Enzyme design. Structure first.
Site, PDB file in Angstrom:
ATOM      1  N   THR A   1     -32.507  -6.406  19.293  1.00 31.25           N
ATOM      2  CA  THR A   1     -31.720  -7.622  19.135  1.00 31.25           C
ATOM      3  C   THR A   1     -30.288  -7.260  18.754  1.00 31.25           C
ATOM      4  O   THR A   1     -30.007  -6.118  18.382  1.00 31.25           O
ATOM      5  CB  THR A   1     -32.311  -8.525  18.039  1.00 31.25           C
ATOM      6  OG1 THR A   1     -32.315  -7.818  16.793  1.00 31.25           O
ATOM      7  CG2 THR A   1     -33.734  -8.922  18.390  1.00 31.25           C
ATOM      8  N   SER A   2     -29.385  -8.228  18.844  1.00 35.99           N
ATOM      9  CA  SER A   2     -27.991  -7.985  18.503  1.00 35.99           C
ATOM     10  C   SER A   2     -27.822  -7.857  16.994  1.00 35.99           C
ATOM     11  O   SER A   2     -28.628  -8.379  16.219  1.00 35.99           O
ATOM     12  CB  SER A   2     -27.111  -9.115  19.043  1.00 35.99           C
ATOM     13  OG  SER A   2     -27.526 -10.368  18.534  1.00 35.99           O
TER      14      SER A   2
ATOM     15  N   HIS B   1     -28.725   0.139  15.069  1.00 36.10           N
ATOM     16  CA  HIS B   1     -30.111   0.110  14.625  1.00 36.10           C
ATOM     17  C   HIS B   1     -30.429   1.587  14.463  1.00 36.10           C
ATOM     18  O   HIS B   1     -29.750   2.430  15.043  1.00 36.10           O
ATOM     19  CB  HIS B   1     -31.043  -0.467  15.700  1.00 36.10           C
ATOM     20  CG  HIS B   1     -30.868  -1.934  15.944  1.00 36.10           C
ATOM     21  ND1 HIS B   1     -30.957  -2.873  14.940  1.00 36.10           N
ATOM     22  CD2 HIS B   1     -30.661  -2.627  17.089  1.00 36.10           C
ATOM     23  CE1 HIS B   1     -30.815  -4.081  15.454  1.00 36.10           C
ATOM     24  NE2 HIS B   1     -30.634  -3.960  16.758  1.00 36.10           N
ATOM     25  N   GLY B   2     -31.453   1.907  13.684  1.00 29.92           N
ATOM     26  CA  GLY B   2     -31.803   3.302  13.516  1.00 29.92           C
ATOM     27  C   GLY B   2     -33.161   3.516  12.895  1.00 29.92           C
ATOM     28  O   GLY B   2     -33.856   2.562  12.546  1.00 29.92           O
TER      29      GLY B   2
ATOM     30  N   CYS C   1     -31.103   1.742   9.682  1.00 26.34           N
ATOM     31  CA  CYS C   1     -32.379   1.930   9.001  1.00 26.34           C
ATOM     32  C   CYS C   1     -32.767   3.399   9.072  1.00 26.34           C
ATOM     33  O   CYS C   1     -32.335   4.124   9.974  1.00 26.34           O
ATOM     34  CB  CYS C   1     -33.487   1.096   9.662  1.00 26.34           C
ATOM     35  SG  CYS C   1     -33.335  -0.687   9.410  1.00 26.34           S
TER      36      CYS C   1
END
Lengths: 103, 146, 103, 146
Positions: D34-35, D93-94, D135
């Site tokens: 997601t954005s 994101h991660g 993350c």
């Protein structure tokens, strides 16, 4: 300013807060030890604590340890694979304040 | 009174705190691990160093994975109310996120969880230091000429 | 004193030396972001840099960031699983010297 | 001259250095990600902050895993001789040890290796800072009352 994630009435801190991990080596790497004088990291840590514990904040002391280990030590081995290697300690801080051993 | 900043941990409690040293030199043959020559020098150096910093140093030699967990659990259950901080030094063979007892590995996370802000209230808000002398993998640094 | 692993004629440093990783959260944890104001970590990092970059060493600045995030922020979610959670940034230093943005 | 200590990095080179900001907000539908609402605020805050610290700020938005690697490789091949340091901020994101490009993950190690002391000589001995907003797992901190 105002939002949904700040200035809580009941003050809390992370359960993982206030931990400091002083690793002898970088993630994924071997750590070196001299069979006679002890590990490079502990030798250096004790030397820097004895010399700076009553003068510097802990993170700055550990930074001196990083430099001592990184510059002064290099492995010696009859096995070329493990010869002439270097090491750099790894400071992992989740502390929320400065730490001085003296007051 | 005057302006209070609170930028550094309160280290003037009656006691500086405990300094638990786990010195693993000899490992069970069944593990196939070799002895860690020179570790006793580290253990002794640490005891003297933290002694002069006024820490209550407690040393333990060659502990199994069970004893390591029991020791940490017991220590975390002590009343650290009058202590400024907590220190634990681990000397042994290791891998990323792992420290070896004399008969097997111990997840570092399992050791540190005992001291979580919510599990050891007398240390909540106080510095908990873990000094780890152990491998974190099998990579070697060839270094570079300065 | 003398040994096989110190005082090398040719001076070298670890290839992993002089790196600093400023992580927004502790190892293994989620990292929080306010859909409107940005991430807790970056908000706090910028605020502490603007306020202390010309006054404090980098590690001490990052320590202020750790405290700001740990004390001032708590998640809000309609999903109980993700509600009222905390976060603590993670400083990973392999630096060998103190770092001041000013001179 | 007088006593020289050398306890802090030389930060008086002609240039403070580069500050590369990788701002990933929109991800390819094929990834199912997601954005990241609000990331543009972070990117802008960073640009202004490091601008006032005299860094050469370069921003990049929505980069694929290939572009991230290419960007880092290209930047590491620049001559940083007149620069005091290097800064890279990653917003995406991660997961532990991973940062997501718009079409897939990128190992943080692959990004940082370009700057190893032996691979980027003009930065050898200089501070290389990586700021990561992402993350590192799926654990949640319930926190504890102070």
């Amino acid at each position: 300013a105002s939002g949904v994630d700040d200035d809580m009435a009941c003050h809390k801190i992370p359960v993982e807060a206030d931990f400091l991990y002083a690793y002898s080596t970088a993630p994924g790497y071997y750590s070196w030890r001299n069979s006679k004088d002890g590990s490079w990291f502990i030798q250096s840590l004790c030397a820097m604590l004895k010399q700076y514990a009553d003068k510097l904040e802990f993170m700055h002391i550990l930074t001196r340890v990083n430099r001592k280990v990184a510059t002064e030590f290099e492995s010696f081995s009859f096995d070329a694979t493990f010869h002439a290697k270097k090491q750099i300690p790894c400071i992992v801080s989740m502390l929320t304040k400065e730490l001085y051993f003296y007051h | 009174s005057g302006i209070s900043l609170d930028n550094s941990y309160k280290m003037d409690y009656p006691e500086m705190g405990l300094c638990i040293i786990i010195n693993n030199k000899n490992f069970h043959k069944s593990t196939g691990m070799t002895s860690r020559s020179g570790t006793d020098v580290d253990a002794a150096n640490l005891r003297e160093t933290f002694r002069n910093l006024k820490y209550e140093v407690r040393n333990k030699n060659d502990l199994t994975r069970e004893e390591i967990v029991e020791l940490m659990r017991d220590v975390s259950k002590e009343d650290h109310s009058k202590r400024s901080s907590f220190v634990c030094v681990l000397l042994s063979h290791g891998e990323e996120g792992i420290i070896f007892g004399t008969n097997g590995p111990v997840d570092l996370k399992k050791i540190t969880n005992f001291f979580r802000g919510d599990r050891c209230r007398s240390l909540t808000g106080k510095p908990k230091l873990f000094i780890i002398q152990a491998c974190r993998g099998t990579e070697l640094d060839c270094g570079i000429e300065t």
